[PDB]
């Protein structure tokens, strides 16, 4: 459908709940008949600059071929969740599958 690239930045104290978030988001997509191409936890990572008075964050990359309705629901989930700090969804021309240059 519409290939999206989703990266979100989690509060590092909520690092244990990350696979629970990933499994809910994946069940949202596949429940909406969407594909998941790559799914790359980047772990805790030192920020370039302190957002929200803190210096590290837990990063998650996810490439998705879903309809836009569940993506707007996912954006609202990121909006109202206080565990997630930043969320970025970027529309992509195609489905990407190769690992990230920082997953290496």
């Amino acid at each position: 459908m519409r290939h999206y690239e989703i990266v979100f930045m989690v509060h590092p104290d909520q690092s244990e709940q990350v696979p629970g978030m990933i499994e809910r988001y994946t069940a949202a997509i596949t429940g909406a008949e969407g594909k998941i191409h790559r799914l790359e936890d980047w772990g805790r990572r030192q920020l370039a600059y302190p957002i929200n008075k803190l210096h590290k964050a837990h990063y998650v990359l996810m490439n998705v071929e879903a309809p836009q309705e569940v993506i707007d629901e996912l954006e609202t989930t990121f909006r109202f969740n206080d565990a997630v700090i930043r969320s970025m969804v970027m529309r992509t021309k195609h489905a990407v599958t190769e690992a990230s240059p920082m997953v290496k």
Partner: protein, 149 residues
């Protein structure tokens, strides 16, 4: 307000002490809590000859029945399956009456003025620690796991 004590109070005297206090402190807290009698010389001859050891015996057998209860408050775990949201954020809290409800349903039938909480609601599913004040001295702890329903 000269007043004789029936129990030791942490800053003025022990049992059997005739200490001047303020009137609102005797009239509102000590006397209505049975902790002090205003120092009438009739009360003094009433107390010091007989009750100088009668109140020391019932206060010691009270501290021994409590310090027995605090010792037996080694039951140590209470799992309360309250309602919760996702990623923490418990829907419905566990209060003082609900903690006393759960140690009654597992252990001692305990009351709410013994429970010590820094926050008190803990509307958060997971582990926490809760201290007790079943005596003026002897405190107990039970790990309570509030679990999402």
């Amino acid at each position: 307000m000269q007043v004789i004590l029936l129990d030791k109070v942490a800053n003025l005297g022990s049992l059997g002490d005739q200490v001047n206090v303020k009137a609102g402190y005797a009239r509102n807290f000590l006397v209505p809590q049975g902790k002090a009698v205003p120092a009438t010389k009739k009360n003094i001859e009433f107390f010091e000859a007989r009750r100088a050891e009668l109140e020391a015996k019932l206060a010691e057998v009270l501290a021994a029945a409590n310090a027995r209860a605090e010792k037996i408050n080694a039951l140590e775990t209470v799992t309360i399956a309250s309602k919760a949201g996702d990623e923490g954020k418990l829907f419905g809290s566990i209060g003082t009456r609900d903690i006393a409800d759960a140690v009654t349903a597992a252990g001692v039938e305990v009351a709410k003025s013994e429970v010590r909480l820094p926050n008190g609601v803990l509307r958060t599913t997971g582990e926490h620690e809760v201290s007790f004040q079943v005596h003026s001295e002897v405190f107990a702890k039970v790990i309570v796991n509030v679990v999402a329903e």
